[PDB]
Amino acid sequence: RNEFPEDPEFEAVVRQAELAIERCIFPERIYQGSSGSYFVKDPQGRIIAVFKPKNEEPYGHLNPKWTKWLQKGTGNIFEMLRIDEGLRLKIYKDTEGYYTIGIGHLLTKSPSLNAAKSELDKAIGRNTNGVITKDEAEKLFNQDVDAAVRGILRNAKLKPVYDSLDAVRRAALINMVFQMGETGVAGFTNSLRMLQQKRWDEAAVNLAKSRWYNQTPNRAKRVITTFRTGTWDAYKNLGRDCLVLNQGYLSEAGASLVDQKLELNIVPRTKVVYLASETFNYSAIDRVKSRIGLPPKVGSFQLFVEGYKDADYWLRRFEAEPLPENTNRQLLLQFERLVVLDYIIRNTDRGNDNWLIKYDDWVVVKEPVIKVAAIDNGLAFPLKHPDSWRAYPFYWAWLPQAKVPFSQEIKDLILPKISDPNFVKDLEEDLYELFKKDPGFDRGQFHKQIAVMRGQILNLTQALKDNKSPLHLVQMPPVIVETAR
Secondary structure, X not given: OOXXXXXXXXXXXXXXXXXXXXXXXXXXXXXXXXXXXXXXXXXOOXXXXXXXXXXXXXXXXXXXXXXXXXXXXXXXXXXXXXXXXXXXXXXXXXXXXXXXXXXXEEEEOOOOHHHHHHHXXXXXXXXXXOEOOHHHHHHHHHHHHHHHHHHHHOOOOOXXXXXXXXXXXXXXXXXXXXXXXXXXXXXXXXXXXXXXXXXXXXXXXXXXXXXXXXXXXXXXXXXXXXXXXXXXXXXXXXXXXXXXXXXXXXXXXXXXXXXXXXXXXOOOOEEEEEEOXXXXXXXXXXXXXXXXXXXXXXEEEEXXXXXXXXXXXXXXXXXXXXXXXXXXXXXXXXXXXXXHHHHHHOOOOOOOOOEEEEEOOOOOOOOOOEEEEEOOOOOOOOOOOOXXXXXXXXXXXXXXXXXXXXXXXXXXHHHHHHOOHHHHHHHHHHHHHHHOOOOOOOHHHHHXXXXXXXXXXXXXXXXXXXXXXXXXXXXXXXXXXXXXX
């Protein structure tokens, strides 16, 4: 159901896309991405668009690279525990204060370091002097995994639950029996009944209350959601606690929405579009029912623009052979729009590869020589400000152009809009109408997104009024505007 009466030009392109698929000219997947990005083509084979299905997103269920991981099933227990337990080659104390070594291997509960050390020589077969190798630790690791697996199947209370769990949850239960051991996990008897009956939101509360979890919550919460959601998402990107889990396509489209309203026109038109292409990556299930073909995938659909190179490419040339003032001033005006965009949507990833430049008494306006396209916007709209601004900065801030004070021209375009609360309200409603279409939408998550955005506008407004530069703008302490309810 793809229709866009507001943008008949956009719709026409989409119809060429579909029709081209019918004729078996399929969108081809870019390898120069690292996700599910495709080049949409028209019946003549030309590239009209870039398409990024939701489910092929880096956190996406159907991403080809991480499908192999999903094949493993329980066998991901090795990697799963490697992440939680880490690797150390010399004796240390665990969270409870007990002597540990290698990968989560408990030597003893004794306070004596040589108890642990004696016990360690037994295991390895030599005099270790408290230091082992990577391989020795790996050898301990397997046995401890085996011991866990054994512990579960040898236990009357534990085993039934385990057999009823899918391959992924099973791995989670092993995780527990790895940390607390057989007997310890069997004191959870409540939750095991529940887990067995398949109620996920049921058990996830009760696991929140244990002698366990309190000691190691950072780890514990990682399992609870592996039980609840039956997926590996908590072990993927647990450093991007700044962004929503799998809504990049909406970011992409949202960025273009914002651009439209602010009238920046640096963002090639991007909308939510459904497509089916034999070239996509589908579940085995889906593949079979096609023999009534493949279902449409939901994704971001971004128009393709020609004549552009990477920002880095042009500035390199402009540094050696500086543009004439008037041309160079067209760059600067394009740059501000970018700065306004990224700040408003709070982009967390913008490099010199992420935006593009093109360098070439009347009723009509002379063409611009220079023009800026802003691509790859799916990493914006964070739930909150990054913990360390240095990790997720605004890169262009270190460019010399960011030192130059905001032009009156941009202020005239943007200040009347962002000073008008009914504009910002309308803008928030439009974003809501976009984001809510996602099955995994959460009203509470949304409010935080809006909060950052409302705080960014707050900062930008006063930056523009004071005629501050872009650089001085990002030095302004980040804020959020939160609704109390």
